[PDB]
Every structure is written in structure tokens, then in C-alpha cells.
Amino acid sequence: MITDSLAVVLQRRDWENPGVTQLNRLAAHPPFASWRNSEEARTDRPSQQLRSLNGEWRFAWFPAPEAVPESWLECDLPEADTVVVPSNWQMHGYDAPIYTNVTYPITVNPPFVPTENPTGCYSLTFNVDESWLQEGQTRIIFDGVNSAFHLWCNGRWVGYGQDSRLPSEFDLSAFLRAGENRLAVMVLRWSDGSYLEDQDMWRMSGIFRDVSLLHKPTTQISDFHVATRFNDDFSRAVLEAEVQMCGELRDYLRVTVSLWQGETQVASGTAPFGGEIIDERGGYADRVTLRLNVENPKLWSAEIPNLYRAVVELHTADGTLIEAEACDVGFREVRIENGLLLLNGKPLLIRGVNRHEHHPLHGQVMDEQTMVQDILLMKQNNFNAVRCSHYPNHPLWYTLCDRYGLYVVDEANIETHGMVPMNRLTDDPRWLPAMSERVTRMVQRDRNHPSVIIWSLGNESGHGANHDALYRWIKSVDPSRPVQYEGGGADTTATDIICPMYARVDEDQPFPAVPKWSIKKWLSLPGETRPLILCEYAHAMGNSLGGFAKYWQAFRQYPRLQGGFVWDWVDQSLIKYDENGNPWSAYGGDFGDTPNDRQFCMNGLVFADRTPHPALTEAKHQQQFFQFRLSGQTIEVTSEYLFRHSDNELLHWMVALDGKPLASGEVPLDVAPQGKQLIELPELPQPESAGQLWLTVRVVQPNATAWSEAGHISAWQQWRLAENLSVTLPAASHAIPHLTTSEMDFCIELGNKRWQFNRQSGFLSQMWIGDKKQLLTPLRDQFTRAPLDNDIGVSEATRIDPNAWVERWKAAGHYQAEAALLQCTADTLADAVLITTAHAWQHQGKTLFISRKTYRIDGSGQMAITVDVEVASDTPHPARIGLNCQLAQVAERVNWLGLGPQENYPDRLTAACFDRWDLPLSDMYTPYVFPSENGLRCGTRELNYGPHQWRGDFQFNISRYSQQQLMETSHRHLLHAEEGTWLNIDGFHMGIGGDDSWSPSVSAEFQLSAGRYHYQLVWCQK
């Protein structure tokens, strides 16, 4: 009673002692349901022995654990509110969530936490059945409680837990009473284990996972391990099932291991308890092993996820069933040989993506629906693997990955990024136990899931001897799954697969003592033989993911480059409400946190509500399982599938002349795994009309898969066919334009058409049709764009990074350059009026750009603008070379002939196809929450907007928001639509990068460094 009081518990600061990480906590095991019937376990029916405690709980908040009154042990306080479980109290409003990347959210002082420790007091009052108390053992399972937590049952102290992403089990057989039962959980936000929880997420705390109650008999199945051994041709399989019990040893106890495929029983085995002799003292008397022979097993893979149901029944000699535990087993073997990772004897090509557990509305509380939607999006966007992102995930996630066929790289909850140096805790043996608790238990939890193929020690923890010891422990316990570790440059002895972060394809970044070579050179280093799979690459932070084509070309060309994991899947945004209560996404810094990072949480390929980014189309196109090669008139189709045959795919081809279709057809696909097929196209019609012939092929799945709908497109490709150049001549313009030369203006009139050039500025001041003005602002040049997330880097107002693109642009005066008029002349021709303008942009007496324009008004109404731009070599390369204007008329449709229909950039245009796309103006603006340059469409041959038509080769972006507004504003909900419509037509555009979000990632081939540029535009009224 006295020892169960708060004073005794809080005197021993278990949240500040690295030696003490658990108290009265049961050992980890694969998930159990305690089925009392074999048929219920085989069909995965819900078990009445498994009770869910999720629901309405009583919550109280305190600024310090010592501020909690002791009367909370006896009864709930009247001021306590009613919340839901699982839920995080930071989302409710009790505490402000804090986001951080490198620095710790608390003062670094291991193993001491600050005194102001936020404390959550959870209470639940329920009723238990009397049959649960007469016999058996009743335990409580917390699937996850953030940081440390103390448990009380009926006013008596039960145990203490420290891990956040691993289940904690406590025995309540001697604590539960018959009738009313009230528990009391005291959760602390910061503990000593939070020094190992420095992951890239929002730091929330509380019971964010399910709380369950399990009842077992007096004799239990404490653990069971399953493994599969194959031969060279994978025709005979040996399933080894080792079962460990706990409790009294009796001679009549038997274990039956049954394997089922659907409803058909495949193999079975019944043996009495007692194992083989291992040591001089004998063998285990409480473990029994079973060897089941399977003839021609259906192998498991991400393409075909064949699953078997394994039921372990502990019963008596007479056949009376005591307990039954079921699991899903997939027959597969991952092994590294000759420096190659082989699954079922075939080289894997990982198309994975980093995935953070982030609910759109509930924060870190993950449910089945969001998980299923994420899996469907991954599989539809050509992803076959998923990384757990530096912590263990929901146990249901692995089951769903087994069901849908996704490779899983399970990660431990170890991260010491804030420590200086990074191995400060990972080399100290005093922290060796705690890290092991965050590893070994996880190894014991998900070793029976065929989706899990690679174990991970951690990330951004440096390299310590503890990491080597844990790597050796995992390799000794589970040799079936190769493991990896990023820390130490990923060339250390703690890894079997070279897994660097953001290693570029060709350019090297030789950091001191931790260099990041190119992957091609990394494979060619002396003494290196392990395969290379990128744990983190292609940082997609907002408008990003450039150079993905180079990455996948390097992956496909090199046999030992087996792909990588895109970082990351889902944006980490928190919803917030304004003074109307309108919902809007928010990033770090919007919750009143002083030690926070900016929008660096807002990386991913989808939004918070699983809305796909334009980069997801690029990711889908670059990860296609079908490669196409057009030779002459035939098409070579090469499948990248390793285990499945092309039985649910057909090829659909279409030939188009400048967006107008001419011929089409459907050819079924019959391709062997990693095979070749030849498709002979029929006679392709080639008209004499001017234009370019484009051939587009797509792969359509006719039937509905478990993860895709009917008519889903999995791959596509486009080629340029024969071109017929336009050699016809325009008709002679009977009407001639009339030019009036004012003192300050040049006005050209052609019937309805009218133009007015301002002689003081040298730009096209106004356009007129009838009596309606068409320009709110003059058509000027634009050598700057809104800075992207990759351009800013890690540069803030208080910290200036000289290597960032935006800092070099503003340092050279690109955003502050004022145009100075040099020449502005006008003269009439025989059938046209020529306007010659020449300007120069200067900053502090230094000329940066010189623009010379020639305007030609034809008698047919066309405006021919030829622009020549000279850029200084010493100045930083401009991000844009082209024009800028604000039209005075808004339109509801935009019809452009060019590459689309998605947002594409010079380094991200492979996914876009050349066609005629008619889209609403609302879809022209990509709703990035952090405002930046967006909506650009490259390869545009024609652009129709309202009464205006632009022709030529250019990159256009059209939106309701100016570039200066996108520069000034920091949130998308604060953006307001301006009058008219802003249009930016650029002759040349500069890349976006995407290798990393802290260094210049744009390759030299996509930089505007030629020096002299020229582009021609034709503006007419349609």
C-alpha cells in the first residue's frame, strides 16, 4: 500500500536510469489470440478470449509527474475529461506537438530529462468475467505507449514500461478482482529512452496504439518459430516449427502443427514434447520441433503472394484441445550470394518507399482503413517494398503486407541523431541493454511474417560496438533474413547490404570520415562485394523528385544496384483550424515551438489525405515492370517480373498526329518472367499534313486484382515517329497594320486588333480586342522563379547558407534587378510592323542579363516575338528565361498541345506524354501547402486560353497567384486569387533537383549555363 503509493514509485526515477528499462514485463512473442477451437483459428475468426480495451477512457493532464495527486490511485478525479483510446493528447489540445529533425526537443543531458515532464493520467473502469479468474492467466497488452509509463491495477503497482513502438505485456492474474476493475496508467512524455527516439516525426506522446486483454490456460504456448528450407529448384520444402510452452510439464501433452492452403490440408505433424540433445546436460524439455514436408509449394512473392495457414494446437493425448495459435506462413527464401540479394533464386529489384505512420486526422494512431488505402496506392503506383522508417509498425501492417504482397524492411526504434558525436550512446555499454530491448523483442515479434525480409538496426546512430553486437545477435538468431545498417557510411561490419542515404548517381560528396561516393563508384571500391540498396534516396520535398530517371537507369544497368527506397511516402502535416474553423494543413513552427524545424516534415509523394502529388506519376513511370523498345515498326516488350507470367495484361497502341488520333489497336501480352516479346505493328498511316507523329503504348489490366480496378494502367511509353515539316507559305496579308508613333507610346491598329507599346519601359503595355483590355500588367521578362523547397535548402533568416540557390540568386540581385531601357524602335514594313526592343537588367552597377526582343505584327493578326537573352558567366545561373504577364480575363478551361497532363519539369518530364490536354484552371495550380513554383508544363507546342493562342516551343505555367505572392506567402491557405490570370511562358527553364533538400542537387545538364538563349513565340486570337 505504502510502496504502491506515488512517493515510492517516483523516488526511483526509472525514466532517468538506463539500466532499468522494464519491470514485471512479460517476454515478447509473436501475436497471440488464444483460440480454443481449431476451426476458428484456421479461419482467423475473432477470439472471445481476446478482449479489446479501446474506447472511452478518463484522462487528466499534469505538468510534472510529482504534481499528480495520490487520490488518483483510488478514484478518478472529477476534473478529468473523457477521451478516446488509442489517441494522442497533443492532438486534443493538452500539449503542443513539437517537430524536430536534428536537435533534440529537450536539453541534451543523458540520462536526465527536464523536470517539467508532461504527464498523462489514463483511467479505465471495466468488468471482467468470473471464468477468467477461476483458471488461467490474464495479461494486459499495450501495443504501444510513447516513452515511459507506470501501471496500477486496483491501486496496486503492476509494472513499468519504456519502449514506445513495441508491445508491453503485464500479468494481471494476481491483481484483477471479480466485478469492477479500475486501472491507472501514468504516461510520461520524456524519458531516458527518448534519447533513442530521435526519429524524423512529430514528437507526440500517450497511448497511441491498441490496448488489449488476453486470457490463457494454466498451460500455454509461450512461443512458436516457423522456418522454410528449400532445395535448388524449390520443389520440395521442409517447414520447421519449433514450439516453446510455459507451465507444468506433463507426459500427455501433444503438439499438432497443421498446414492449410485455403481449405485443403497440405501437411501435418504430431510429436510429444522433448527436443534433440544440444549440450552436455541434454536438450530442452519444453520445446518440440516439427518437420513438415511440402511437395511443390506455392512460393510467396510481391507479385504472387501465396500464403499458407499454420495452426499449432497444444492438446492432450486423448484429443482434448487445450489451446490453438494460428499464423500465416509464406514459402520464400532471401539469401545474399555472389554479392546479390536473391529471393527464390531470382535477383530482386527493390522499388521501395519510406513510410511514416501518420494518420490524416488522428496523428500517429493508425487504423486498418488508412493502411489498406496506403497499400493500394503503393501497389497501384508500382511499389513492391516498404520500409518501416526507423521504428516497428502495427502488427496488422505486416499481416496486410503478407496478404497484398509487399516486401517489408523492419526497423528498430534506435536513433541518436542529436547526440554529438552520433555514436555517443551507441558505443557506451551502459546503453547496450536498452538498445537490445528495442531490437531483440522486435526480432521475436515479426520473425514469422514472410513480408519482413530485411532487419534494420537503426538509422543515424553513428557506428558503435553495440551495433556490431546486435547485428551479430540478429544474424545468429535469424540467418534467413539478411540485415542492414546505415550508420557509419554503410561500409561497416554491422551491415550486409550497402545502404547509404541520398547517394548520387555520378557526382561524389567526400565528407570527412563519412564520404558519400556515387553508387557506381561505391560498387567498384576495392574489397567491396556486398550489394547496394539505397535506404534513403530521391528526397521528394514539395516540388522535387528530379533525376529519378538517372537513378533507375543506374539501377537497371548495374546488376548489383538493386533499387532503393524513396523518401518518403506521406507528408507529415497536422490539420489546424482558423477563426472560421476552416481546416488547413500546418507544419513545424505553427504550434508555438521554439526548438523546431520548418516544413522539412512535409516530404512525400502523397498529401495528408492521400492525394497524389505530380511526382507520384514520375515514380510510377520510372518503376514500371515492363520495358519497351521501338525498332523500325516492331516493339520489344521486356517484362521485369521475376515469378509471374503476363496473363492479366494487354498492350494498347495509338498513333496520333499533333494530338489527333489516326490508328489504334489492342494486342494481348504473353511474356514469360524476365522474358521478351515482339509485337509487329500494322501499317501506320502517315498523312502528308504537317505535324509530328507520336506513338503511345500502354499496358492495361482487364480483370480486377485485389489491389487494382478494371482498366488499370501499369506501364506506358511514347516515341516520336516520322515528321512532316511544314513547307507551305502563309497567305498574303491583304490588310496592313497601321502604326501611330506617339511621344511615349507606339500604337498598332489592325481592324479589331490593337496593341500599345510603352516607349518609356519598352514592353507591350496593352492589348485590345474591341473595347476590352487584355493585360493588367505589361508583358515583361522574368529571370526569377518562386524558390522551391530544394532551392532554399537549410537556409533560414537567422542562418544563411551560401551554397543554397536562393541565397546566390538574392545575393547577385536577381530578385532585385531593375530593367533599364536601351533601345525601342518601330518601323513599318511592306506588309508588317516591326518593333525592336532591347533592355538590360542591372544590380549595383553590374549587368546580369541583356534581353533583345523583336515584335512583328502581321496583317493576318499574328504577333511574332523573337527574344535573345545574354547571361553573364560569373553570375549564378538563372532559374528561368522567358516572359511573364497577367491577363485581364479568367477562363475555366485550358487547352494545350504538349507534354502532360501532369506537372512536369526539364528533369521530371519522362512520365508526361505528348498529347492534347484540356484541363480546368483549378488543376493548373498544384496545391503545395508551402508555396513555390508549380504548374509548369514542358514541351508545349500550343496553348489555348480563352481568346488567346500561343504557339512555339516553350514551358508555360498559368495560375491565379503571382510569383511574388508565392514568394512572400508561407501557407497555401493564406494565398488569395488575384485579378485576371497570371501566365509565365519561359523559353528555357532550370531544373528542380531532388537528390537532397540541403545541397544543390541539380545536375549540370539541367542548369541554364549556355550563356546565349533564343526563343520564338506566336501570339494570336483564336
Next chain:
Amino acid sequence: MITDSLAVVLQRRDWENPGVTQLNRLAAHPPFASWRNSEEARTDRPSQQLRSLNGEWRFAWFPAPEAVPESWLECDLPEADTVVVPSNWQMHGYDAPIYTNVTYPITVNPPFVPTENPTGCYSLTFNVDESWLQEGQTRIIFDGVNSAFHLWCNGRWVGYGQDSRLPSEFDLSAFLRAGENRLAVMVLRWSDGSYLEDQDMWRMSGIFRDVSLLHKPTTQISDFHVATRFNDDFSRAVLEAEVQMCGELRDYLRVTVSLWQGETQVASGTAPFGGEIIDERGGYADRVTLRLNVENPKLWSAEIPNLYRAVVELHTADGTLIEAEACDVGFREVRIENGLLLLNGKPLLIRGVNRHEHHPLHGQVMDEQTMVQDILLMKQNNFNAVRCSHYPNHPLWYTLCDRYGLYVVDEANIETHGMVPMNRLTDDPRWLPAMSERVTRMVQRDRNHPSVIIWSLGNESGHGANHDALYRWIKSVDPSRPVQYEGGGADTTATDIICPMYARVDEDQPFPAVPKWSIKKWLSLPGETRPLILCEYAHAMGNSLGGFAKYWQAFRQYPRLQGGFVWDWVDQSLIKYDENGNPWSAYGGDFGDTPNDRQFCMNGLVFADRTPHPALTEAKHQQQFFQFRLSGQTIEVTSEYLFRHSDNELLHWMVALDGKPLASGEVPLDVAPQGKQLIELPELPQPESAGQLWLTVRVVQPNATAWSEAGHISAWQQWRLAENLSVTLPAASHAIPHLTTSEMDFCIELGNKRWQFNRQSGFLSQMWIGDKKQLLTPLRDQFTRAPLDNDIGVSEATRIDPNAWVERWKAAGHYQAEAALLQCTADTLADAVLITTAHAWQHQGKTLFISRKTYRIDGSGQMAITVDVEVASDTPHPARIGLNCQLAQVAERVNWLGLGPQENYPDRLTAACFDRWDLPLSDMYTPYVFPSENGLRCGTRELNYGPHQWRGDFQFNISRYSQQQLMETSHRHLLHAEEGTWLNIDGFHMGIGGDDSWSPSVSAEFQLSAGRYHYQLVWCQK
């Protein structure tokens, strides 16, 4: 106050929780003295900052920890006695010590200990200086406290410790007060960590090691690591010294690492704090590394232990010294290449011996004098290595080994022999932290000692993944020292050196799943490349250590067989007092323990009082560093030294004819390391007198070494030179014997001489000279001996082992065979009287042995006895074939010409030399505490005892105790001298074994299995 009470502490059973192994305990480090002066640290002067708390303490004993009153926290109880510290309370009489080998001393139930937990309450009241409280940190160091212990300072709880053989340090800066300070230590005999302390010793408990108090400044030298890197010729050395501090970081702090050889400074280095960049966050700001260049360093080895003094001085920029820490560094490099362990580029030949920390009087409390005496005995008996025997030893032991030059194999305190199976705790990750605490700290304690060359994970713990993880951790932290592990058969991945236990030279013992092949076949197994060094071999249990010559021949012949460790050095006997108080040695079972083993603790090469066994001479002879080969007249001397030159050795040769010297000389030895020398002997005198010429060479050290006296002999050898057979004839016997044939007797009279044969028994009933009887019992046959410790094995009264030699002997009726007379005839010759006797030994109607004897009385007085013995093939081989008698006269001198002067056996006669030895009768009996057969001398050509002289080739043993008394009695102090003197002359003797003490270890070449034997004896009066 309330939390400091006993109720709060004992509510949390920290001795029953594997997760909690330490509370408020400082990190491990190399030993510190906190010198405030550089000259004091260089000369290793005692430091006044280091206080010793050893002395008189107040002790109380309680049967349970819950029985301790709380008033013990405030003041000592009046009923508490005054004991010494360090000391074990089992020796005082509070508790009975228990010895056990395999089974646990408690009921096996991890991690629960029995409720009846013996508890010792220690208290010390002292005074501290005020200057220690104004500044700096004061800590208390327990060098060793057995099992768990709780600490209180001035009534306030300080910490909790669990390890027994490793130091535990607690901070007392906030607990100590000015003036009187009283501490309170509560020590528990059994804890959860005792499951890892199942070593082969007496289970004592209490504070058995030193208690010390250390004072450090506010800025400390927390740790320092030293390492040496060499080139291929070991001419240039790089000493790397890494220093870690604790406390405030200041810019003026400097570290000076100075190296001294005697008084001469060799190298120095001063650098500011700050290390190299290691990770992306930078490097350590509190560690500084120093690289010192040494030109032509004096390498350290067991032959020449060259030592340097390394002084690390933390001071300021102006030169004000803050702290100084000194250590001993030896320049050496142990590395395994090509499957060979090389020290300084030379293949080591380990001559080690297992050594248990066992004081002759104080139990486990070890002091400097006993350690120095043990080291001197080891070095004088040709031992160059010593194993820590399954636990860390005194920190002074490693320093003394560095000073005297002994290789040390440091072992961790891990042993789970009683667990079924043996890896039950070593594969469970829940016990992974605790084992790491018993490893990593030890790695941090003795990594700066050049004597330590091999780390050890443990012994008899099976094989678990925790062992692999710990092996990888040690290999990552300290790659300079190769490690080994016995568990799992010593072919597992957790070892680098194959170290089996009691692996025989040629015969295999294929145990299931843990086979013990022969070492020669073990080296030749497929896929095996690691060298083989026996961790335990040649079990010397009492009369043992047979076949050592075969072991060392195998070691010398095979390059990859690099020797082994004899088991063990010192007997584990406890002194006890009888009702006179006379001291006598006692083994397990004499302290009222029901779960105990018998004298299996009483193994070793020396007694409790360091009295050498006769097997120590064999160990010394078989481990000589000089090998001799006699060819013709010259002698080849080959040195086995690897680094030293023969500068303190001279060869002394002597030629003897039947024990009478003829020529001698001294030749100095000038032999290179592993070199060859040729000694040409002068003209050896060969007289025509009958006899055998023996050449004996010895190696004598003239000067006094630090471990040997002047005139010490290190090696010796003997050879048989040319033999002159006796062809002369005995003189004609003028007097003839007179024979009287009685009905029941045959009486032969020859002047003074008289003999009487009993016709009913057929044996020599009596001998007479004058009127004095010479035989108390008739001279009969003896086919049995007292069973040795190797013959009994693990067989007791309640457990019968059918493979034990003694059980086969008593099952066949060897000890119960009754002699049946077959023939007894007498007849006079021309000058002699012939007596022909023939007997037969039977048991249950089955004849075992048949003896036929011929007695001849010559007129000169000689008795010629020719004995022929026939032994059945199916019966077990007898241990002895020869005669037995009890003379009626005791004598004070025994003069025998034969092999001696030590106790030698047919498999242990290599150390004995053939000469004439005159020794007292008291030295004829080896004082083995467990009575067995002893005192046998083989190769005896003549034996003079009183008026009797025996001639021939025989093995004799003479003592005051009969063989039946040695069989019946179980202690040496209960033995009583019988009337007369018992003499056993045997024509043939059977081996003793010694490979192990639980299986028949005698080779087939030393077994009496010929079937027919013959021997001749000549008995006369001199």
C-alpha cells in the same frame, strides 16, 4: 527517509529481477589512484587521495533479508560482532560453506531465489577530511562483494550491486557528512546473478575483496586506453593513448602523456582536447588522442617482461597539474595469422595452468604474499601462462603478472552449468544485459594490462546468441587480443581458438551433438583453420597426471597445437579443527551440506599450503624450455625460448655406474632463441665392472633471477649409456641349508638365517634372524590396489558407474578373491632348497588369477622367488601384479637404486631419474588428504630397508598404512600408523590415467592385459 527504509527497498526484489543489475553505479574504468603529483605517479608511490577501508567492521547475520530490523540503518545492533574486512562470514562460522560442481546449491527456478536467503549486515564508522567535502567527488569502490548487496550512507540509500568479481563504484559526494560517517552494507548470499556464478568452487559470500575510498577533482580523467602498433620487424612503435574526461569543458585543459623506461623519459606528447571527426555531427569534444613514437622498443614477453611507465597528466595551459594517472604498458602484439597465434611474430607454446583464487586460511580473500608465492612457484615449475578460471581476479594479480612475465587469459564471471540445457539463460535475450555487465565492464578494467592476452566469454554455458553478440562486441572494441570460448564444443563462431576440455591425444569420445575428438583429428577436420589451445586438460585429481608426456609430444610435434592449461593449480580444501583443535584439510561434505560433491574440489598440483605434489615434478619436466638429444657422444641442445638468449644457464653433465659417479663437468650454454647448440663430451670412462652407465644432464642458472634462486635447475635429461652385463659366477656355497618337513610347516635353517613356510596357506609364514621375527603377516600376492581418484570416477554409494575401474574390480571379486592352495612341495638340491607353490584366486566359482611361485634358498643366504601369474582375459585387468607383506621392524632410512626421488608411475616416470636415493620413511608416503595408492617407485633395481635387501626389476611402495586402511579411510587425519611397516613389491603395475576424473583415462599400453606375467625377486640380509 520513508523510501530509504527497509520496506521500500525490499519490496522491489532487485535480487530476483534480471533486468535490474545495478543502481546508481559508476561506470567501469582502469584502476585509478588520483595522483596529484607526476613524480609520485611515475614511481607508483601510495596516494593520499586513495584511502583503504579494510579493517575492523561490525557484522550481524540474519536468516532472511526481511528479518533485518530497521534500527540497523540508524545505529549498529549491540549483538553485532567485530569481524575483519575483507573476509567471508562462512569461514567465521555464521554459515556453512557449500561445495558443488554441476547441480546448483539452490532450487533451480530462474530468476527466483529461495526465501531463506542468508543476509550479512556490515557496518563501518569512520571519519572523513573536510578538504574532501569542499571540492571534488568522493566515491566508494567495492573490489568485490559476493552476489547482491545494498548500500546505505548515513541512513540514506545509495545504490545496489550484483556482480561478485568486478568492482562496484558509488558516488558519496552528496551523502558523506563532515565528521562521523557510518555506512551500512546488506549482502545477500543468493541472487538472480548466482545463476551465472556456477563455477567449480566453494560458494562463499560476503565482502571478500578490498573496500576503498577515492577522491577526485571536479574535473576528472574518466578513462584512458593505451594501444601499441608495430611494423614487420618491431623496430618502430606507435603508442596510441586515448583519454576521456568527465566534467566541465574548458579551453585551457591539456593532457600530457609521458612514457618512462626506469628513470629515462622515452617519448612525450601534449595536445589540447578535441578528437578527429568520426560522424556527420563531428567528433568527441571530451576525448583526446596522443600518438607517441618509440624507436627500438623493448618488447614484452613472459621470458623478458620489459615494462614502461605511462603517465597521463591532466593539467592547465600554465602548467598547473590537476590530476595524474599512471599505468604499466608493455610493447607486445598477439595476432592470429595462418591459423597460428603469434606474439611479436613468434608462435607461442602455452604452458598454462588453471588457477583458482583460494587462500590457505582466509578462503577466497587473496593477498599479495600468496599471489607472489604462487607466481614464483609457477615460474620455477616452468609455467608461462595462467588462466583466470571463469572469473576476473584481483587487479593486483594482473600487475604482478606484468612484473613477473606471465600470460593471462582473462575470463568473465559467466557459468550456467546447472541449467538444463546449458544455454537456457545464454540464449534468452532477457538475460542478455546481465551477462554483458559481467563482460563489458571487465573489458574496460583490464584492457591496459599487457599480461592479459586472451579474453574469455565464460565456461560451461552452452552456446547462445548472447555469447556470439558478446564475442563480436569484444572483437570490435579490442581487436588486439584474440578471444576464445569453450561452449558448444569450441567449434562455434563465438571463438577464435579451439579450446576443448580434456580432449585426449588419440582416442575419440563422440558425445551426441558435442563430440570431443582427438586434438590431432580436431586440427584435421574439414573447414577448420583456427589453432587449438586446450583450456582444460590433464585433470590432476590426487594421484593423477598420467599421459602428460603424450600431450606434450603432440604439442611439440604439431605446429598448430600450441599447448594448453593444466587443471588446476591449487587444491580447494578448507581447514578444520578436531576435538584437540588439530588442523586438518577437509573437502565437500564435511560442512553438513546435503547438495554437495565429494573431494572433486581437491584437484591441483600443490596443496593448500603450497606444498608441491609429486605431479608437479612431471609438469616441470614436460614443460622444459630446453630439449636434449644424445647422438653418439655429442649432445644437441635446442632452446624453446622465443625472445631471450641463453645467458644465465650452464649445462652440467654426470656419468654414473649404478649410482656411483665416475666423471662430471660443466659446459656453459650459448643458444640462440629457438636455436641449436652442440656439446661434445670428453672421453667417458667405461669400467669393466658389471652395471649400467647412465648419463644425466641438467641446466643450472648461476645468477639469481627475480623469480628463482641461485642454483635453480630448469631442465634435465637422462640417457642409458653402454651396459656391461654380469657374467661372473657366484662362489660355491660351502654351507648347505637344512630343511625340516613338519606336518603343517616347512622350516629351513641356514646358521643365523631361518625361514618357515605354512603348508596350509602355501605362503612364507615367517622369517627369523637370531631370535627376532621379521614378518607380522605372510608374504602373499596382491592383485588389487587402493582405488585412486581417477579409478573411482563419479561413482558413489547411491550411484554406481559401471565403467569405473573400481566398480569393475569389485564386481568381478578382485577385492574379495580368496586364495586357494593347489600345490605346495619342498625338496633339497645339491646346494639349495627348492619350494614350489601354486595357488589360485577364485570368486563365486570363477578363477581370476593363478599364481605359481618358486622359492630357492641358497647356501649364501639369498632367497630367489620366481613368480608366474596367469590372468583371465574376460576378467577386468588387474591394477597390480606382485607381492605384499608387513615387516615387523620399522626403519628411519630407505635406500633404493632406481627411478626417483619423486613418486613415479608407469605413465608418469619421465621426470624421475635413475640414481641411488636415500630418503626417510616419512617421505615414502605422499600425504594425499583423500587416501589412495601412493608412494610407488618404478624402475627400482635395488631396495635396502633396515637389514633387508631386495634385488631385481620391480615397482615398490613402502608405508606405515596398509592398502585396506587406505581403502576404508576417507581422510588423511584419521589414518593411523600400523605395527611394523607395510611393503608392496609388484612385478607389474597398471596406469593411473589423468585425462579426466569421470571416465577411464588409462591408455591400452599401460593396462595389464598381456595375460601371462613373470618376475624375479632376490631377498637377502645386508
